[PDB]
Structure formats: C-alpha cells, structure tokens
Amino acid sequence: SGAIYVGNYRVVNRHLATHNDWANLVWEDSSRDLLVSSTTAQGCDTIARCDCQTGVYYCSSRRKHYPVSFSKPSLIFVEASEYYPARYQSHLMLAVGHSEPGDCGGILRCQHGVVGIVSTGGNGLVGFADVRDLLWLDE
Ligand SMILES: COc1ccncc1CC(=O)N1CCC[C@H](CCO)C1
Numbered sequence: 001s002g003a004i005y006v007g008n009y010r011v012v013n014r015h016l017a018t019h020n021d022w023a024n025l026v027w028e029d030s031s032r033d034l035l036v037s038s039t040t041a042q043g044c045d046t047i048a049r050c051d052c053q054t055g056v057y058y059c060s061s062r063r064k065h066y067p068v069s070f071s072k073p074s075l076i077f078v079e080a081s082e083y084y085p086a087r088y089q090s091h092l093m094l095a096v097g098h099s100e101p102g103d104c105g106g107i108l109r110c111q112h113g114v115v116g117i118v119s120t121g122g123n124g125l126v127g128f129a130d131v132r133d134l135l136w137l138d139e
C-alpha cells in the first residue's frame with residue numbers, strides 16, 4: 001500500500017483506489033495503473049521533473065529502502081493478475097529488485113523528488129508507474 005500526497009492531490013495504484021477516491025476522481029488511466037483523487041488538506045511530496053535513471057525505493061515486504069537503476073518509462077507487457085488481464089502497461093519503469101503484491105504504493109525517489117510508485121513485479125524485477133510527466137500535479 002501507499003500514496004503520493006502533492007498539493008490537493010492523492011496519487012494511488014488504480015487497482016488499490018478506495019470508494020472515496022473514485023467519488024473524488026481527478027484523473028485515471030487503467031493502462032498506467034494510476035488514479036488521482038482530490039484531497040481536503042495540502043500534501044508535502046515534491047514530484048521530480050527530470051530523466052534520472054537511479055533512485056531509491058521502499059520495499060514494505062523487506063522493511064528496507066533499496067538503491068536501484070531503472071529503465072526509462074515505456075510500454076511493457078505485464079502478465080495477467082487478479083486486477084488486470086494480460087496487457088501492455090504504459091509509462092512503466094523496470095529495475096532488478098524484490099517486490100510482492102502488497103509492495104504496490106511504495107515510493108521510488110531520486111535527488112529531485114518523487115519519481116513514481118511500485119505497480120508490478122515478478123521474477124526478481126520491480127516495475128514502477130512513472131508520475132514525472134504529470135505536470136498538472138504541480139498546479
Ligand atoms: C509489486 O507487485 C508484484 C511483485 C511481485 N509479484 C507480484 C506482484 C503483483 C503484480 O505484479 N500485479 C498485481 C497487482 C497489479 C499489477 C499490474 C499493475 O499494472 C500486477
């Protein structure tokens with residue numbers, strides 16, 4: 001689990017969005033596994049505006065933050081799960097690292113701020129949904 005809190009926005013994995021989130025929907029993209037909902041209080045996370053390919057992510061299944069190199073956001077085939085059929089996930093970044101389903105929501109960060117959140121995994125690879133292109137999160 002986990003979310004990004006920036007301004008009056010809450011960014012979560014779409015497959016983990018609650019009743020409050022869909023009701024207060026700002027934007028969602030199934031192909032990206034992202035959902036943004038409005039919030040009453042102001043958030044304090046800064047979104048990174050960069051092309052960094054190295055950062056640190058939180059892995060709840062290990063209670064540890066791991067440094068990783070990750071690929072640039074792209075269209076990656078993701079195996080079927082209980083949340084989605086087999087499909088190409090867009091704006092996805094992969095790294096060699098540990099992840100489990102309950103690790104979704106874990107933040108990936110570089111020196112510039114929040115890069116994205118854990119979204120997929122399997123076979124010693126962890127996939128992160130990029131949020132750096134969502135410029136409107138800043139306004
Ligand atoms: C972090 O997720 C891990 C990690 C390791 N084994 C499994 C998983 C779960 C996983 O990959 N998926 C289930 C939840 C939605 C995912 C698609 C999102 O577009 C697919």
Ligand SMILES: [Zn+2]
Pocket residue numbers: 048049050051052110111112113
């Ligand atoms: Zn950066």
